[PDB]
Design a binder for this molecule. Structure first.
Ligand SMILES: *CC(=O)N(C[C@@H]1CCNC1=O)NC(=O)[C@H](CC1CCCCC1)NC(=O)[C@@H](NC(=O)OCc1ccccc1)[C@@H](C)OC(C)(C)C
Ligand SMILES: *CC(=O)N(C[C@@H]1CCNC1=O)NC(=O)[C@H](CC1CCCCC1)NC(=O)[C@@H](NC(=O)OCc1ccccc1)[C@@H](C)OC(C)(C)C
Lengths: 301, 301
């Protein structure tokens, strides 16, 4: 028992991380086979990047992998990422995929500086397409990922911090999550909402682990739930969400709509000085998959 | 900016994890050079382990590292760990140390099943010498660790779960943390307390990241603080703790005893429906070292 914010083991990604330097800009890159992926704003000197990049040569790009120089032999830009062709394939390249995730989905972030991994933590992609990360100067190019058996699914590359202290980035094909652009103009996070289906998953985690104090006799309809959810800035729960919570519902003997009735009263009454899984707030950064994985024992290798 | 429960990158430990099987018991072991460390309760059939172990032969022990059989060529017991000599040294052995940590200190746990890493999370050793982990059947032998530049300091090996759902284990030389013994009798966690110096560190993290609402005009003496701390089940703050919080005090311009005055009013008044660093509880599982590392950028390789 117990329940923690669990990240995936990070070794498979650590072996891919490199330092990319050109001009006076140094950031992190991701070395898979003979390509290094990194944010395009590494390009020298409001910008027009196509114009900026036709002006660069290969030898402008310094790529360090450990104590080893990597030689750039080609380059191309795909949306907001730069792809640098190197003369050596990364022998530690794991089995991998690039995937663009939906808001509400979680991932592990390997925070990196100068191509050296610093820490790992778990995140979710917020409904407003930001992530509440932990990032300092030089972290751009750090990636977010999930692991399925042996396969690393990369889903995030870090680019910028917004005035409110949250973080914006791209998929590994360089498309921003959300409306953000890679220029230092004026952008803000849109208003965020709570990921309802994730909150329900976490309540099921609590029940699996022995917390029951918040359950009740009542039930509710999907529609009447959503009426109370919208009031408290929660995302609507759809029938797909209900279906996803099936296995957890079956393991605990609590109908999904019954646990919705429980959430309803938690929202209307507060938690009255009790905790759930060591939290005095309703937690929304565990997916139904996350809960099942941590409470059944799923490994990866 | 941002502040997360950050674990160390786990790759260096992943490369050491193996499966140890003997009789009908299978658990995790830690392969460093030509020795595999694992909990001694892997020994077959209230127990006298010296008597149990003189009855075993080397070929009784099946060690799997990936798809590779490892041959046991010697064995010895040191306190509550078994040390199995194998005919092959682990080529992925990192630079390492074994260290016995003090309560209040944090570490990363790489949760493992059948020698396969499952997830990584951050923990603290509680004042009562338990850890609030996340562990299922088969996780014994998973280790906890810290990283200093290139060196892995192993400090924990997982052994048991206690009735309250918290976890007990040993250092890597096999000495239990706390009064616990490796037999299935009747043991309970002693009463726990909050790690005061860690709470203060986290308040400094909040100030570094821009939260200021909890500061105040007041100050306090060490003695009068401890008088209020003891009331709320907080550990006494010593002058060593004060000295440790020096650098954080200097970076923020807030005298340690001034931030103690702030904590005092937080304890007496509650948080009044505000949050600190996304938490509605006072958090105590970040050390002063943890805060500085995450808010200055310290990497490891
Ligand atoms: C590359 C990098 O390390 N990084 C991550 C940042 C650094 C600190 N924490 C992080 O997560 N990104 C940046 O430093 C980028 C670099 C730019 C990106 C666009 C292309 C040119 C290079 N800068 C930022 O993240 C800015 N954010 C920003 O300009 O947002 C747009 C904006 C500007 C003004 C008003 C509103 C919105 C950061 C560093 O600046 C602030 C002040 C927001 C923290
Ligand atoms: C090896 C292993 O995986 N593991 C970790 C446990 C499993 C579930 N979560 C975990 O962290 N340890 C055990 O399963 C051990 C095995 C014993 C250890 C002692 C030597 C013989 C093998 N068992 C337990 O952890 C027990 N705990 C226990 O007996 O505590 C003592 C006790 C007993 C009765 C009353 C009070 C105190 C667990 C599995 O049993 C409970 C019911 C407490 C969960």
């Amino acid at each position: 028992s117990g329940f923690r914010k669990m990240a995936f083991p990070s070794g498979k990604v650590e072996g891919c991380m490199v330092q990319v330097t050109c001009g006076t800009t140094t950031l992190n890159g991701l070395w898979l086979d003979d390509v290094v992926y990194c944010p395009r704003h590494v390009i020298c000197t409001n910008p027009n990047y196509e114009d900026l990049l036709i002006r660069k040569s290969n030898h402008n790009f310094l790529v360090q992998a450990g104590n080893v120089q990597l030689r750039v032999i080609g380059h191309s830009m795909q949306n907001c990422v730069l792809k640098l062709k190197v003369d050596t394939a990364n022998p530690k390249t794991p089995k991998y995929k690039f995937v663009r995730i939906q808001p509400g989905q979680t991932f592990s972030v390997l925070a990196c500086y100068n191509g050296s991994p610093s820490g790992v933590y778990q995140c979710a992609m917020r409904p407003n397409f930001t992530i509440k990360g932990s990032f300092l100067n030089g972290s751009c190019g750090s990636v977010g990922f999930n692991i399925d058996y042996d396969c690393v699914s990369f889903c995030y590359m870090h680019h910028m911090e917004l005035p409110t202290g949250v973080h914006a980035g791209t998929d590994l094909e360089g498309n921003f999550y959300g409306p953000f652009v890679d220029r230092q103009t004026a952008q803000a996070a849109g208003t965020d909402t709570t990921i309802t289906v994730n909150v329900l998953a976490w309540l099921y985690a609590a029940v699996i682990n022995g917390d029951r104090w918040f359950l009740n006799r009542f039930t509710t309809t999907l529609n009447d739930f959503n009426l109370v959810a919208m009031k408290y800035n929660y995302e609507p729960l759809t029938q797909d969400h209900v279906d996803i919570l099936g296995p957890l519902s079956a393991q605990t003997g609590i109908a999904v709509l019954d646990m919705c009735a429980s959430l309803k009263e938690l929202l209307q009454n507060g938690m009255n000085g009790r905790t759930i899984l060591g939290s005095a707030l309703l937690e929304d950064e565990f997916t139904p998959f996350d809960v099942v994985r941590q409470c059944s024992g799923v490994t990866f290798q």
